[PDB]
Design a protein around this nucleic acid. Structure first.
Lengths: 67, 96, 223, 107
RNA sequence: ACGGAAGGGCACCACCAGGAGUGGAGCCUGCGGCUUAAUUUGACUCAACACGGGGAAACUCACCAGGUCCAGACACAAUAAGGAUUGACAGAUUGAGAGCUCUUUCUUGAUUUUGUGGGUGGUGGUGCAUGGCCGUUCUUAGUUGGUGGAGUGAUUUGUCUGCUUAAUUGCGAUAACGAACGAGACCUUAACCUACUAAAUAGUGGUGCUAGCAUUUGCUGGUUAUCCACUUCUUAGAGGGACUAUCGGUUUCAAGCCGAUGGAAGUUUGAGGCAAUAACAGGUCUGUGAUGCCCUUAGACGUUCUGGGCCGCACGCGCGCUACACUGACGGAGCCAGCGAGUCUAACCUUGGCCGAGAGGUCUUGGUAAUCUUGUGAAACUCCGUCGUGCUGGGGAUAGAGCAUUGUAAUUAUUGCUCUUCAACGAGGAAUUCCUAGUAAGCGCAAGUCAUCAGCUUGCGUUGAUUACGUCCCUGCCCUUUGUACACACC
């Protein structure tokens, strides 16, 4: 069950919302960005958020998404 | 309890002096640390002293912790025929 | 001595347990709240944390003497190999044990269960605590047993932050009728913490950007 | 004029890894604060003391076993050092909970 | 809240497909039944019965036959310094070298005695008076509040038809919008780190040194200091790493799931720890000096001592252990783990050398431990033979005799050893438990218990399949819809 939790998708939401002059479609740069931008008390969590904000990122780059 | 007044002397002297007693819940122990009597003698003499409100009694982990009280000092005084303002652990010892 | 450090550490632990026990029993009327044992050169330092150190000291240092003599005599220590200090606990309303013994001593004064509990939780909140809940189990004035939860604020119950934030005390108030169980819970503010993880593994805070004024063709600046 | 080259092995041992490592690296760096000869903090395999119990006070119920574990951590550091600097390294670097022991040893 | 009402789901404590079995056999072991001076007791569907850490020779111990002691605080009163009161040699006696009792008569010195009141102790009662703890619902996903909408209202909406996940997990529809508890996060561990810090308690390379075979240069060992060097293996600190990634199928191009690639690892990475609100007259006063009340308290239901008993056997049931053999027994030989654990005011873990068929003994030793036992040279297992389907050399119950060890004590045989005795059991009725990958099952250790006693247990590693990768047929459980005259809620 790889269904990302609510705080994850909510966080990815806020990120892509207020930091599109940054990020890309690469998990690495997104993750490192995530560290130099948000205080995520966990590596695993931050990487969850980064991977998902990455999927949302690559999915806005073909046609926008709700929220 | 039934004990010779000699061991009563050992006990009451020891308490009036050291101001504090300790004794494990273990009868049949022949003899006690510091005091020269059968452990029982101490425990029961202390039940006596503690019921008439002269000492304070506590337990925890199989050990009778005996505090002394102020009327207890009055009565250790009375029982050891020594003047008012005698001894007890009411002195600053060395400098500790 | 000449022990296996397994048994040394274990024995150290059991020593602590018996210690906190004895102090708890002996210093209830003084709002005792825990100890720590310190192995140093020359002496070994037991440090008390009651709320009433002016009385724990005793008549010009007579009672702390009684207790030091006690511990000494019991655990077999040479007169000076052990010393007991008694320094007050900062914010008595953040260590569970203190509030536990508190409400207990409230109900030994016959105050309304609701009144005592609600006043306890109110105090705990007012002492800048993230949350607090006091469960009261047992039989009381009635016949069949009952229980009462009293929560206020924020607490979590699951995971590692259990060990990190919340304090859980369980004190058995004994009355003429039967007995009651005073369970006390205090969630202390993560933001403070001083030492250790200062925010919940949940809390992911995003920082807010700033307006930028682009336009106006490039140019450069020579220093 | 005291001061003579003694071989030493100070062993730290405790259950709180943060303070143990604290006093460990503090010791190694405060002893290397002055070019002293040494074999730095050697880590002994972490000891795990287990206790396997029944959760129940009595007998009834599913057979739920609860497992407890406490952890011993032992470091040992070797220093080649005189007499003063040793009493100096023993007086300070004291930690409430960390068991420190200072052995001469050379045969 | 409940239903012998309707519709969906969930699940190896459910099916399916198979696996290994259990149920039949001997024995071990618990429960019942009986027996008994006593055969102490709680627990009886899942959620009682290899459970109370319950492997009882004494003790434990609660039971039975018996003998002691008070360890009955304290207050009042009473007795009494012409003596209130304790002890005892011997004997009578008694299981007993108990002055328990008595014979006789020394001693002791206000410690006690008697009496009342009051205490105290109690594995005595009440878990249906309670604390606490635990088990079960639950191998579950539920609880709540702010602004707002509907209602006089208690309340409702949020918190929902669908879809998707292990998840009130998401997506999505949408009078709701955004949230907190719980799930998730987190923790802990097993997986990766020729990247960092290092280590005669870990280990490698080189060399001093030396043995063997080669002798051409070698190959194979020794040398807890002969130095030098390294940190890949080992150890543990700090960091890295995965976020179901990349590509691509399928689906309201949504959550997601499916496949190939890559990767230490892509079933919540594998396995655990914690874990909401609420419920039960679940269990536990036989863990507690946690406790209310009741009962007992000197011919004790207090404790202690001797002896016995929980093991008593026509039979019912449960967890099991060893088997019926030829993918085997026997016998030589090959030989590899991982989790542990160990002695101070002591005899714990024991290498080595001899004595012995064996069990064991005896003399030394290392080790408070990564340093010694120990590389725990474990067992299954692999290899060479013997036996050859014959209740056989499979099987080892039953039983006689002899040596040893634990322990004050081994008879009703604690355990271990050798000789002989050579049962039932020829794959097992209806029935029924567990299980989806290093899993099942086979194999053995360590640890708990422990003086001596594992056929139990908690972990650990060793060899390593078959069959799903689904469903709602049996079962159990959730969810709505529905009824209700229940609400201490179908007991």
């Amino acid at each position: 069950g790889r269904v990302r939790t609510k705080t994850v998708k909510r966080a990815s939401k806020a990120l892509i919302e207020r930091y599109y002059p940054k990020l890309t479609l690469d998990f690495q740069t997104n993750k490192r960005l995530c560290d130099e931008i948000a205080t995520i008390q966990s590596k695993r969590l931050r990487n969850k958020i980064a991977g998902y904000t990455t999927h949302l990122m690559k999915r806005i780059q073909k046609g926008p998404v709700r929220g | 309890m039934l004990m010779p007044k000699e061991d009563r002397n050992k006990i009451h002297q020891y308490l009036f002096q050291e101001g504090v007693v300790v004794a494990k819940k273990d009868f049949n122990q022949a003899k006690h640390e510091e005091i020269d009597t059968k452990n029982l003698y101490v425990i029961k003499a202390l039940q006596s002293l503690t019921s008439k409100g002269y000492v304070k009694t506590q337990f925890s982990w199989q050990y009778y912790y005996y505090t002394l009280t102020e009327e207890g000092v009055e009565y250790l005084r009375e029982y050891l025929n020594l003047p008012x303002x005698x001894x007890x652990x009411x002195x600053x010892x060395x400098x500790x | 001595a000449l022990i296996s450090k397994k048994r040394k550490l274990v024995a150290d632990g059991v020593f602590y347990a018996e210690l906190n026990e004895f102090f708890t029993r002996e210093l209830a009327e003084e709002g005792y709240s825990g100890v720590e044992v310190r192995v140093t050169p020359t002496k070994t330092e037991v440090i008390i944390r009651a709320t009433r150190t002016q009385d724990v000291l005793g008549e010009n240092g007579r009672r702390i003497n009684e207790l030091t003599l006690l511990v000494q005599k019991r655990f077999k220590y040479a007169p000076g190999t052990i010393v007991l200090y008694a320094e007050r606990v900062q914010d008595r309303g953040l260590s569970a044990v203190a509030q536990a013994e508190s409400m207990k001593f409230k109900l030994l004064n016959g105050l309304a269960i609701r009144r005592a509990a609600y006043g306890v939780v109110r105090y705990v909140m007012e002492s800048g605590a993230k949350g607090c809940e006091v469960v009261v189990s047992g039989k009381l004035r009635a016949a069949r047993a009952k229980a009462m939860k009293f929560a206020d604020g924020f607490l979590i119950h699951s995971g590692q932050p259990v060990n990190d934030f919340i304090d859980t005390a369980t004190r058995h108030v004994l009355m003429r009728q039967g007995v009651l169980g005073i369970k006390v819970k205090i969630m202390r503010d993560p933001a403070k913490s001083r030492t250790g993880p200062k925010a919940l593994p949940d809390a992911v805070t995003i920082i807010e950007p700033k307006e930028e004024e682009p336009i106006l063709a490039p140019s450069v600046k020579d220093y | 004029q005291q001061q003579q080259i003694i071989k030493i092995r100070i062993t730290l041992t405790s259950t709180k890894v943060k303070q143990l490592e604290n006093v460990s690296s503090n010791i190694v760096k405060n002893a290397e604060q002055h070019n002293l000869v040494k074999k730095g903090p050697v880590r002994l395999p972490t000891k795990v003391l287990k206790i396997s119990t029944r959760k129940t006070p009595n007998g009834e119920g599913s057979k739920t076993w609860e497992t407890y574990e406490m952890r011993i951590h032992k470091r040992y550091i070797d220093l080649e050092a005189p007499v003063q600097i040793v009493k100096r390294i023993t007086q300070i670097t004291i930690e409430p909970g960390v068991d420190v022991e200072v052995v001469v040893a050379s045969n």
